[model samples]
Target chain A: QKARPVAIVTGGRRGIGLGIARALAASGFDIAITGIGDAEGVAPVIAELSGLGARVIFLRADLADLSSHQATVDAVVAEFGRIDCLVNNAGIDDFLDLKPENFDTIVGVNLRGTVFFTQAVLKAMLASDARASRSIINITSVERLDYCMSKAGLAAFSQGLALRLAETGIAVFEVRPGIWGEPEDIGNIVAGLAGGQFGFATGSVIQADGGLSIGR
Target chain B: MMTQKARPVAIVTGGRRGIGLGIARALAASGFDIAITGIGDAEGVAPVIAELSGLGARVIFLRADLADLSSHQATVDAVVAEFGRIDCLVNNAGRDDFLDLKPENFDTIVGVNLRGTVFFTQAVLKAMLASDARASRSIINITSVERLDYCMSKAGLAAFSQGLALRLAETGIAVFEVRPGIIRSRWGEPEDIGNIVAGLAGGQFGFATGSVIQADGGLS
Candidate 1:
């Protein structure tokens, strides 16, 4: 029997991240997901993913604390053996007002945290001899304030990483989700990308934004 | 002799050289007092200051390290004390390293390019609120099209400019972002960027706030 491929979704306990995890599990991939809080709190979420016939483990992590990135990746690889896909879905935003602390918190998680954490995951991906179609799916949204900037930054990072890893068989893509998207809508697209449905289009930005961001 | 009117003031961060210098020279020629901040001391940037002064505009130089959040207020204070008002702020100071892919470099790039610029602009915005400059007050961010971390920083800056423009619309403080694209001017001079900044700073276009004008020379 062939071993199942594995995916790690940051902030996968709730909202879009959970939706992506659920879709991937239902799509036949074992899942390792990161979120905040203890396992007892997320017991139901773990059981839901487990019920999809996918082996699931929950790892608690705060993306903004760069120090914890390596350990998080290590824990996932330890449980799953090798990482086939990484969904950078963890991010936060503040729109009430633009203060320095608020700006720092949002950009720290959405951009800096995502960048460095991806770096750690890439190191693990490159070290493995896994022949599976490894990929990265960055979930960026069209937010208005610091959220918008952070997502735009992620979009650029997705393209740059794609270009850098072009020959490495590790494809990278960005998904700019629109206001109308359900978590599962984004999940299916991410599952498709991870499953090599669009293998030839590496570095592509899928405008799942539903044309709402279209400028005349 | 006709009585000489006071020139509108502009603060060009990282204006001691390159794109910032180009902007400083252009604003000077366009009849504006110039305050150029740089990481270097006054002694090092004296030549550039002398050149701008020669352009017939009063020039002042303040040393600033954009990465230092603590020094942002002091820099703004010095500019307001010397120039009395800040009508335009061009955030042009940034650094990038293509060879190094380490985390340290990531910190440095994001630190100077995004973190510093965001906070520094925050301080300047407060000062802009207090000023009585009747002419259009604007914030222009200078960003690039590529270079991994640098590209992300600029893209974020572009969003910041747009959001800020929307927020400040009621206040009449216009905000714009300029993305210099790939061109034969890829070997381009700094003045290329300078001229654009000067025009936006001079309010050459009306209702153009929150606009991200790409000067890519039509590179499809």
Candidate 2:
């Protein structure tokens, strides 16, 4: 029985993911994180988030492995009863040269993984007993052919869902955090978006790059 | 020859007026040797260049057809060849056309605004990444609201920038977007946007790659 909203952050163990995960906690929203692979820094992140004064949980799951998606989301819904925001920040970007496995890995974890996880979260939100403005923040990146393609797709999905979910009062945002992105920065943006900072942009792709869109 | 004091160089597109002019003025005050481009009469361009230079900035203006993609690469070469290097880029050239969604009108608007902006930036980036390039640089895209077609272009630029920032991260370059919402009569001050672009170029916010800063006063 909690009074605050709940959040789900994918890949919140470290880097940009953890930043968003802990930030939601600081914002007075209880957050749960799903770790990529085996929870690498699971305990530390959850502990840090707990210190932020929120009930934080870490679930071990692989986004590419469809088996883990629904159960992990179910666990969050079962624990919190309602989710106020879903931050899909967990993604992979290997520095290795383009290879078959590399392509599959980035696309699988960044793109496919996000698709399933978000759908499940959407369903849970729809069936929930709560009535609040639900929000979804998908963290995508620039560059890396496979990574970018996957993110572009994810952005499209967020936009599509934004339109469909608007009637239900759910706002979706696709945030592309470029090279200068710290976990905390993206987290803060998520908080703003969830707090209705730019209510007018329901299906917008927010580019936070200093100005690369018009770069040079 | 070499730019005075080795001051950083900036090219403000569509800078003879409005938001573009504001940014050109601010950066000149910030000690950036400046360049202004796009279609404008001498009456508008002269005082701007004079004032900026009077503020101790070495300023130059290049005229070009924004919708003409052919001149894009050449424009970048002109700036770099003259200034010797580029430190920041302010993409402030654009227009607002309301009540015209016709395909022809779309071309006149989107073509020059988005497409031209995109290609010119591509040219600028390539030159910046040339073997003779700055170790690090900044870029700020000045985008606005109120026009859906205009928003459509800026929105796409926002997405494209996200991807480019990542690709060029290792190259020691950063990119950001500045969006203005409204001031009076659904408008905003050019200098307000100018200050933002200057702040970003001057490193007021550390490493804001693929980020958007709205100066529109929270209209949406």
Candidate 3:
């Protein structure tokens, strides 16, 4: 019998991360999640995965630490035996107001952490004996400049890496999720912007809070 | 006898070759005095400049290196000293190829295409604003396709151009971006961009500010 593909989702304990994890699990992946959120929620999430008939595991991980990232990958590999997909959704927006202090924190978690974690996962996936194609998805936000800049860097990095790994049967993609405001609120906001009631400048903000971004 | 006002003055970087030369000649044909800078072979451009001059247009050539930011002001100043007024600025100077893709190449392309463009536009705008030529001022940037290093630098230029347009919009000067797909130049041309750019410059398409007009044979 063919083994099920293993998926690792960072920051998968709550919010959009959890939503994506659940969705992937439903799509036939044995789910492995890492984050610093509540562990109690995992039981219900696991139950849902069980309903879908897929294995699930949660690992406590602080994405901001480099060593923790490697350990998390090790844990996922040990549990699932092989990983087929990695979703980098773990992120933090410290709301640094362009000050030096805030800038460092934003760069640390959003840029450095994301870069290292992605490197670790790519190394592990390539070394694994999995016979199928592997995929990596990076979750990024629009509110912080650091986040956007890091994602821009990652997009370049991913494109280069994808080209390099294309022969190896691994694909790397950067999935930039639009603003995570309440779903209903964002719909209304988009409608308002389209209706011209809000004179939002072009390239301002469009997904949520009426900001304009590059369309995928 | 009444005479028309002097033709608008423009500076086109990388204007000695390829798409830059095309834009420079086109702008010159449309009654704008032209100044072109290039780092490649300049022999072919001299004839084009002479042809423009034969058409009663003033033209100048500069050997400015875009990698050096300090040289930007001097280039613009030379144009101003000759033309007496600057109305349009075209940021078209860029390096090419993937082998041309290195940290230095990236820096050079961005410096010339983005930073140099910004500095030149700012200098020209300041001169215009301080004088009476503030109205009808325009800035056109030439960008490209292909996932080469040029793509990333052009992307940065597009973002910078958009922000500059917003900031300068209230001042009545328009900022425009023109992205040529594959062009049939000496380096290979996209062929269809001429009509697209003509349409844009004709102003029939009003909603073009901070927007990219793809002329890549629909590859965009």
Candidate 4:
């Protein structure tokens, strides 16, 4: 069922996800885009990918809803035969309340949503090809830890999983997006990870983030 | 310390292990008497305390919880009471929380790193501004690009340093922000930030206030 390596980009309807989707497609991977947005809002991204000659499909899934995790991963595996890459790039900020309810909202969508979906994707990607390279790249941020705390968790997780999956041929990478860069700048790194260009450095926190962390 | 009278003094927060201890070591090596702060007793820091004192600098340990602002005034008061005066204040005490950014952890992280450092610096500034001002009293903030909680705290502290420097510049109390990049095994060696703090306190960079220097091994 798989003609080329299959990849999924969460929150691909816009922002960083769209750029990652385009880069992966350009790198010869079939693309699956997911988000809660309606079909109308997703049409432009679809059209843009089609213009790039990428075989792409859109899946509607709310990261906050755990029930959709299996369905999303199942859709990718079913269509593409086996999964190759996953990018956990969707996130949101309430900008109010540092308490539990507010904390739950961001973590639900950003951390848990990204994590469970990744777990499902890994179940398939791990079984794909033990010889060829496979990967998971998580896009994170700097100051918005309130909204981006999950990104930090993803970073720690990436470090552990990178070592665990070291011999299995699946690499986990965490990318901290800079404060001042565009999604396109980060998409290149995402595309590189999926393409096995950085196989030497798995589990590295690749900083596409300009100088936000460096105080430059 | 009998023969070490009249030496400049430095107050290092969380100066027990890692980078904080490294700061304490460097300051002591620079011929400045050190007043180190932490939550433990004289015994916890006795090893380093004695080590620094052996270097011919008077080193004293001050026990205090940085997250506790109420203890801040008394902490500095004790430093002044014992050391005669403070020539440098290095806000290097910070707790790192990864991922699991729960509200409880968030409170502790912000409290110790941001709030504690803020008031502690304020208390020390009260004394620094009143001092001779010509003796090179300074504030050194050590920050990194690792954890989000730490990044925000240091970013806030970095912002506070700029504002404080402006207000204290005319008075000769210099402020400096030393941003360290990711290092091997750890974020940075204590001596990494220690050296930066020592440079600022020693007046190596003259007439520079509110200046940010990056010693992150060229990560920038």
Candidate 5:
């Protein structure tokens, strides 16, 4: 039997993660998702995928725990039988408070988790016979200091790794959405911030509060 | 002679030598109090500070390693303690040479040039907000024209500086980026570059902010 293309999305239960999963499924790739919240969040997303006639599976796991990240990848490979794409969309925001606990929590989820998960998935994809040209898209944000710093590190990592894996037909790209307030808003926040309608100094009320102007 | 009510306080990182020293000399000649920080090549810097002091302007020095990110805030604090207020900040301290251009070099350069600049600017802005000083706080970031490492770090610095300018625009703080062209200094003598920088720092050029002012003599 021929293997089907599969895409795994971290934090696929809601927001941009769900939107990306739906889009990929609509485009004909089977989807696997990991959500930290209730498994019920995956029901609506899976239904949408079913409507597109694509296979979808949801795994419950906390990305901050490194062991869970490995298990999440294993579960996806077991269900989907093959993985071609990995979208790292899971992230958290701990702004202005700057307390030690808050800082660690934000860094743990946004930086360490993203790094380990990408490592795990890339390893699996490289070893899989069904894997063809693979793409890894890291969903990064414009707000949250830890997010920004970690994503910056990730961007650097992706560029170097992409070059290293290019010979093996693997591609990596960091998709930084500017202050996304809604699941469907891909580049709108970037456009608005560049237009000067919103500012970042205002506390985290969403919209363009995510330091979008910094990139502008 | 015009008796200016408020003396301008300028902090130039890596100011104890080279282009930073030249800028410090120019600002001192213009009757502004100057503070400098750096751990490298302090031999002739003390003489320059003494000269500025002789000119009746306050001259202070803080030995700081730009590689240590936390020292950014400490340097600003020491300057504020000595000068009473900080009106201008010049991010001039930077790593110049790394041979192989590996990942470690990239990290070090970015950490010092980009990350250090961002965190220092934030800390200084916080200090400015707490003080009763008027909102004319200006930040000048010295950048290069060649060298991919410098250029990339400067590009990030430019982006951050522009964002900072827009964010602080309503607050009356101005962020200016100065991109020096192939300067004729030790490589050649570019006195004109010094003049251009002094003019900008003295508020002679009032129409621009978040601008990369190029002082290179038409280097393509």
Candidate 6:
């Protein structure tokens, strides 16, 4: 029997992350979901994915804590054996309220933290044997200036990293999600890209805002 | 013709040479007093300082190291002390270690391009807010499309520009980012970028805030 691919969805315990975890679970991939919450509290969500005929493991991680990045990657590889896809889906914000003292908390996890975490993930992916598909997906948006800038930096990193990894088998993509049916809708888009349906479209940014960001 | 004291003031970091010098020249020629900051000693920057003065600008040179976080407030303070108020701030100082991707190089580039600029702008924003001047004020960031780390830092700066503009929407402080590409005609001239900075700082695009002008010959 062929081994199933493994995907790590940061902040996969709930909301859009949970939606993405659900979709990937349903799509024939073993999932290593990372977020806050104890094993008992997450037991129900695990059962739902395991019921989808896939192996599921939950790793508690805080993207804001930079020191834990390498260990997180190590724990995932220890459980899943290999990483085929990485969805940089974890982020934080204070809505319309933020001060300079608290700015780092948001930008740290959203942009800086994401960069270093991806660095660790890439190193793991490089050491693994060749696979049919390997990809990095970044979730971005068009709202809130501070949040907007963090995503903008992520978008640029996606493109640049795509170029750097062009010679390698890995592909990179950015999804700027706008107002939506919200989470489930975003889940499907991510599933398709991570599953390598858009093989030739590396470095592409999908504006899933349903044209809400378009000129009115 | 406005008196020297009545004219608006602009602070152009890295303004002693290259694209920064070009920007300082353009702003000076356009009726703005110029305060140019550089890492060079005062004697070494005397020629450019003289050139700006010749353009009828009251010029001051602030020795700065953008990577030094401690130096930012002093630099902004000196500009405001000399000019009384800051009408425009052009964040044009940056380093391009194009061929390297080592972690050390990443820190060097980001330290100057992203971290330093963020804090420096924070200091300048305080100055902009203290004044009740009704005239339009701006923060213009100059960025490029080359090198991975450089692109990464500039992209962050671009987002900050948009966010700051939104934050200051009620205060009337417009923020802009000019992403310059390979100039087709004047391949190496800094004036190409200077013209764009001068135009945006002059409020040529009224009511346009948080927008990026792709000066890159449609390459991006």
Q: How many residue pairs clash in all the candidates, one count each?
A: 2, 17, 14, 2, 2, 0
Model no. 4, DockQ: 0.04
TM-score of 5: 0.66
**Which numbered prediction scores highest in lDDT against the true structure?**
1
Better of 3 and 4 by TM-score: 3
lDDT of 3 by residue, B1-220 (tens): 9777768777777776667767766777667788887655556666877887876778888877765557767877788889887767777755333222344444454323444565556566667677753456667777766433454455556665676666666665677888776666433362244344434454444445666666666665
Per-model fnat list:
0.64, 0.04, 0.00, 0.00, 0.00, 0.52
TM-score of 4: 0.52
Interface RMSD of each: 2.9, 10.9, 7.6, 9.5, 6.9, 4.1
What TM-score would candidate 1 get against the native? 0.89
lDDT of each: 0.81, 0.72, 0.62, 0.73, 0.65, 0.78
Question: How high is the lDDT of residue B128 in model 1?
Answer: 85
Docking class of 6: acceptable
Assess every candidate by TM-score: 0.89, 0.50, 0.60, 0.52, 0.66, 0.87
Q: Each prediction's DockQ? A: 0.54, 0.04, 0.08, 0.04, 0.08, 0.43
* Cα lDDT tens digits for candidate 4, B1-220: 4663468888988877878778888888887888888887767667787899887778888789877768878988898898778888887755333323443554466434455676677778777656674666788887664444444445556666676676666665788888767654235665777777887888776589989888786666
Can you write out model 6's per-residue Cα lDDT over A108-148, one digit (the tens) per residue? 34466787778888889988957467988998774554566
User: Over the stretch A32-71, how does candidate 4's per-residue lDDT look in tens digits?
Assistant: 9988977677777777887776788889888777688888
Give per-residue CA lDDT, model 1, range B52-79, as digits (tens). Answer: 8899889998887878889988999998
Q: Mind giving the per-residue lDDT tens digits that candidate 5 earns over B1-220?
A: 8666768788887777678877777777776788888886556666777777887778888887766656767787888888778877888857432122433455466534556666666677777777844555677877765333444455556665665666556555677777666554434243455555666778654446767777666664
Please tell me which predicted candidate would have the highest DockQ against the true structure.
1
Clashing pairs in 4: A178-A209, B19-B190
**Winner by TM-score:** 1
Docking class of 1: medium
TM-score of chain B of 5: 0.86
